[PDB]
Design a protein around this ligand. Structure first.
Ligand SMILES: Cc1ncc(C[n+]2csc(CCOP(=O)(O)OP(=O)(O)O)c2C)c(N)n1
Ligand SMILES: Cc1ncc(C[n+]2csc(CCOP(=O)(O)OP(=O)(O)O)c2C)c(N)n1
Ligand SMILES: [Cl-]
Ligand SMILES: [Cl-]
Ligand SMILES: [Cl-]
Ligand SMILES: [Cl-]
Ligand SMILES: [Cl-]
Ligand SMILES: [Cl-]
Ligand SMILES: [Cl-]
Ligand SMILES: [Cl-]
Ligand SMILES: [K+]
Ligand SMILES: [K+]
Ligand SMILES: [K+]
Ligand SMILES: [K+]
Ligand SMILES: [Mn+2]
Ligand SMILES: [Mn+2]
Lengths: 370, 336, 370, 336
């Protein structure tokens, strides 16, 4: 058999290759629902300070979510996506990265930022579009970004970040960076053409990227039975030549271990890795980790209570400050369209300023800076 | 809110714009056994409720969910249509039509021409929520019609009300050419109006003069028609100016004759749209009217459009071509 | 394990799933290079009339190719794609279809038409854009189409036909047609987003479609090492839940058998099948079949010679007639843009006619009808 | 052929347009160590020879083939650029840019704005062969610039010659905004001209008045500049009419001031482009010039464009806005 497209024997009988979907790729798990390590050889033995940071990052995210979800129901902010059920996938993976590894994602990734110490004030600034927002109030709520923390600004169109993440990874390879790129997306988003683009480019171009697919069984109302018919997303990886694994997304340690090993190999080998974390669309990552903490003697109900109180205060202080800040100067609607402002765009800005000088009483000028 | 909604065919029922879409779709499926409706999250009734009840009434084989893939949704629809079956695809927000741009522009639009009419996808309609909504920012606000207006072989249609939406959507579904129907999402739950229960049609490529006037012609589509209706009222009360108000309805092919006839009478034109000025559809209308009505023009044609930026979140009230912007432009134009 | 996205056990050790690319999916073959049946249980025992039609269709295509390739080198026609190396994939698969099964393809599919008795006059009419062309001279050469023979008009943009083929298949299901759709594409085209769209939609929507991927190891200059890193296209199918097989594209019988079985199951089960046929980008399908014919006593050198002569004559008669025909009326540049002709489009047509009345001497009017 | 090509920076060498692209690319890679070039079939030198020798000179890590996937190519390029590295993507024919439309319009163009300038893809350039070629039919002929002109945040640039191509491509590559550079493929092997060996820049958003005149302003870009240059010559010889001939060069942001200043002088404008009339970029120029120069206009602004059809194979000689069409329109405009 001398065919350039594939490496294979001949076969002299007709046999279609069947998918193995009923017996899929198994789900890697480190701890059970009572927080006990199942297989000691798989214990990451993370130090107490780090495990507590995982726990506190996850619960602070959950506290933030409760307050901002309510704010959205009241129309104080215009849009909100929660992180419920995704706290462990995000904090556990983030902890396995180097602080300078570049992150691309979308809507369920706030925990990565929280782990990287993004200020409550700045999550809130974006959701309120206030003067403190480095995004200048231009995008809908939860479209976070931080240059300092290597977290590329979210955009609404699904899966667009996937081939972008691959290009950034290719660039890091050339820079001899010893840096990885991680790219988060849901199982729905994986149906987009851009996911096929990204997966294939990462493999053929040998890029140090981790693809992190969260599979929670639903994309809005659509169950995965209407989304795909193979064995989830993990089973697609081998067909692209991508090393793949599936993990229990309610187990921070499983997620951490898979991510840490993917990162190690991706940087060293210049090859992509795919992790599919199984979660629930909304036996929660926070409970499981809590049971682990208790078994080590690392937490108790007094600490649980005090932290609940302290974190609610911290979130409420940031929330209140965020609501009271003015919005940015309306002039900022015109900047950053290009790096420089074209003359014809400046003319539009001048047209707005002339209009507001005459008709300004009909606009919410008192709410916006200067 | 930035607009006010206000205002022969058998029995009618009060319907908002989403209900009127549902009613059009229901009538279509009842009378056309080939017709199917598909896209993201359409089975449970859609994220804006436009398909509620349809799957239970017509079956899972006729109202169904696709994978999350807009290029697929449109390619799939083309394919249904190539067989002669009616394919009514949904794109969840117009902002997300762009993945399908190659399928729309290189395939659907050219399908009939390039085959010498051996094949076609005439029984395809793509409907999608459109236009600003107060807080949709970059990706829940866009008005993409001018991108499609440069593509011969597709029709682009945009209604201003529930009555108009149902008649125009029925005509799109029955028209023998691939159509894009953009539904102004800010109107989906706004005020209801009487809509006929039974099917009826509003013609494509025909503007509607909804108020007669003699001093200036104002042209818009979608929600912006309600802005210019208010501007006409402001002009009358404050300036004694008589405004002829026209809903374009069909972007392409557009009703050149109706607009030119109005401008020959009034001698003045102001065109308004939420989409950005540069490359916007107002440039096509202005250019054309200048070519046909040069001798009748008393003043430069005005375009009051969104600015040449992406659609912002917190700055929306400063971005849109609101009634005060339209009014001021009109004031200056009358004073020319 | 209670996850909606996938059916799987837990695993308590970290293990990435590796692609098996060096030992790929084997290549199904029925006859060797000397035309001998390897495994009698796999002989399709096609009757002599049909096997001769396969042979003659393949050689007539090859004769046509030689003449039209030369015509393109001379600039008599503007563009041409040959079928060399693809004669067996196309004639062998076409013979396994029902005559009314709808075909989508692109540039290497002329043999499907030849098998379905498409007239030489009409292949030539399209390549010359002459008055006999039912495409009205509007597309580049080799963009064939035939409604009567259920062969959807080719378009240049790669892979666009893939999700279209799936929609047509879905429609045929609903019509209770007992019809299949087949969709041809190359391995390069399989890198497009539209291929991911098509594969996934066919599976989730349960469509009676055969995906027929020709893998000849190259897309223009790009070797498959730069195109993908998994085990060809066949290995992608299982990840979408699609029954898949790989075949020897130089073996008409392997291709026929795989296609016939795919067609049988697709129609009955409403499920997609993927066939990846391995060919050479240009031990040829015509030679192999010729050896088979000789072993049965079904052909000889006298027949070979006479057919070579007869087929060259038939092709040259059609070629000469095609070159002598006028091109269509220039008015046909304006029809079929929409079904009806919009008034503003009629105005452009009238503008052209007025222009040619004055400036007509500067245009090739004598070459075009009326 | 439908056109005729005719006509300080150090040492020059005769170069055709493909060679001039190669020279720009070579200069870019020499002086910018981050710069990479990628797309379909670029490694062996490209299907129009624009990258010949570059991989051997700069390495396989810097000049490389991608999979066959235009949405990927553009997304990948964006990603390179987000890191600060220069990404020079190729799209094989402009006709095949549409799969990447969502990445261009929703991502690249909005990248800086939506992030408050925390991230950008300014170091991205997309180059692609463009325009008619005599026999390219629907998918080897297209001029897509008007589709991109409605998208704030991208620059669209089109040269008329080898000298212009190299200076404009260098400026695109170095500009801090995502640029699309469309190379008129009919010119790739047409006549050579002297091109500087070393790098140099031609400014973006600046039209070039290549011939001064006082009776009429003619505006075009790409190959069509050579058509209007000939039309100017026909008008002079046959009508005694003095034509001011302007190459727009940059589609967006466009040089409004240069065009308006010309029309204030001449009082007449004819704009020509191969792209279809409806929604074409000429509508934006006409609209704008009418707004700024209303009182100076002696006649209606003329648009001589391709018809509103897909680009045909055998009918190409009847489709294009050739010199005789432009000439006749100009004759009528002068007689107005
Ligand atoms: C291109 C595009 N199409 C549709 C949408 C609307 N949309 C927002 S979230 C979503 C579901 C995404 O599902 P998944 O990727 O599984 O992530 P999850 O919400 O389950 O975390 C959809 C369809 C979008 N933002 N972009
Ligand atoms: C969307 C798009 N991009 C690029 C091209 C140019 N193109 C024409 S054929 C080809 C190679 C196709 O390779 P493959 O699919 O493997 O088929 P083969 O030519 O090997 O039979 C390319 C890139 C095209 N027609 N469409
Ligand atoms: Cl609360
Ligand atoms: Cl969304
Ligand atoms: Cl405060
Ligand atoms: Cl008010
Ligand atoms: Cl020959
Ligand atoms: Cl091609
Ligand atoms: Cl003859
Ligand atoms: Cl001549
Ligand atoms: K995104
Ligand atoms: K239709
Ligand atoms: K195609
Ligand atoms: K640039
Ligand atoms: Mn999901
Ligand atoms: Mn190939």
């Amino acid at each position: 058999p001398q065919f350039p497209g594939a490496s294979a024997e001949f076969i002299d009988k007709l046999e279609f290759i069947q998918p193995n979907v009923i017996s899929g790729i198994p789900i890697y798990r480190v701890m059970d629902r009572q927080g006990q390590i199942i297989n000691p050889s798989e214990d990451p033995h993370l130090p107490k300070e780090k495990v507590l940071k995982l726990y506190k990052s996850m619960t602070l995210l959950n506290t933030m979510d409760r307050i901002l979800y309510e704010s959205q129901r009241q129309g104080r902010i215009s849009f909100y996506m929660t992180n419920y059920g995704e706290e462990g996938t995000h904090v556990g993976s983030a902890a396995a990265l180097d602080n300078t590894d570049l992150v691309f994602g979308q809507y369920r990734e706030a925990g990565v930022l929280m782990y990287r110490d993004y200020p409550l004030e700045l999550f809130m600034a974006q959701c309120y579009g206030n003067i403190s927002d480095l995004g200048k109030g231009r995008q809908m709520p939860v479209h976070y970004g931080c240059k300092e923390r290597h977290f590329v600004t979210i955009s609404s169109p699904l899966a667009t970040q996937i081939p972008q993440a691959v290009g950034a990874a290719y660039a890091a390879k050339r820079a001899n960076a010893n840096r990885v790129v991680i790219c988060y997306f849901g199982e729905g988003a994986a149906s987009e053409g851009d996911a096929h683009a990204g997966f294939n480019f990462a493999a053929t171009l040998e890029c140090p990227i981790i693809f992190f697919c969260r599979n929670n069984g639903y994309a809005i109302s659509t169950p995965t039975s209407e989304q795909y018919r193979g064995d989830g997303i993990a089973a697609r990886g081998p067909g692209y030549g991508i090393m793949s694994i599936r993990v229990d997304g309610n187990d921070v340690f499983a997620v951490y271990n898979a991510t840490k090993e993917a990162r190690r190999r991706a940087v060293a080998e210049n090859q992509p890795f795919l992790i599919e974390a199984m979660t629930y669309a909304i036996d929660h990552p926070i409970s499981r980790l809590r049971h682990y903490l208790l078994s080590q003697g690392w937490w108790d109900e007094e600490q649980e209570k005090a932290w609940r109180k302290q974190s609610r205060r911290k979130v409420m202080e940031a929330f209140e400050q965020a609501e009271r800040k003015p919005k940015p100067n309306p002039n900022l609607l015109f900047s950053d369209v290009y790096q420089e402002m074209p003359a014809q765009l400046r003319k539009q800005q001048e047209s707005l300023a002339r209009h507001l000088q005459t008709y300004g009483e009909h606009y919410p000028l008192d709410h916006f800076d200067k | 809110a930035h607009f006010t909604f206000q205002p022969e065919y058998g029995q009618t029922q009060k319907m908002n714009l989403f209900q009127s879409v549902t009613s059009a779709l229901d009538n279509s499926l009842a009378k056309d056994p080939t017709a199917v409706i598909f896209g993201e999250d359409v089975a449970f009734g859609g994220v804006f409720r436009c398909t509620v009840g349809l799957r239970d009434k017509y079956g899972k084989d006729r109202v169904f969910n696709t994978p999350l893939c807009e290029q697929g949704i449109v390619g799939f629809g083309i394919g249904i249509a190539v067989t002669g079956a009616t394919a009514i695809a949904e794109i969840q927000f117009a902002d997300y039509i762009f993945p399908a741009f190659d399928q729309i522009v290189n395939e659907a639009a050219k399908y009939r021409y390039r085959s010498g009419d051996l094949f076609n996808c005439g029984s395809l309609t793509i409907r999608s929520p459109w236009g600003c909504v107060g807080h949709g920012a970059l990706y829940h606000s866009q008005s993409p019609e001018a991108f499609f207006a440069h593509c011969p072989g597709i029709k682009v249609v945009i209604p201003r009300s529930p009555f108009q939406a149902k008649g125009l959507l029925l005509s799109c579904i029955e028209d023998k050419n691939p159509c894009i129907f953009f539904e102004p999402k800010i109107l989906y739950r706004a005020a209801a109006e009487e809509v006929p229960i039974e099917p009826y049609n509003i013609p494509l490529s025909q503007a509607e003069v909804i108020q007669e006037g003699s001093d200036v012609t104002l042209v818009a589509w979608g929600t912006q028609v309600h802005v210019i209706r208010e501007v006409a009222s402001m002009a009358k009360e404050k300036l004694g100016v008589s405004c002829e108000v026209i809903d374009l309805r069909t972007i392409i092919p557009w009703d050149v004759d109706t607009i030119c006839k109005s401008v020959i009478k009034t001698g003045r034109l102001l065109i308004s749209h939420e989409a950005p000025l540069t490359g916007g559809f107002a440039s096509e209308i202005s250019s054309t009217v200048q070519e046909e009505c040069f001798l009748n023009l008393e003043a430069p044609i005005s375009r009051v459009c969104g600015y040449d930026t992406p659609f912002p979140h917190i700055f929306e009230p400063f971005y849109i071509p609101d009634k005060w912007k339209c009014y001021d432009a009109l004031r200056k134009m009358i004073n020319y």
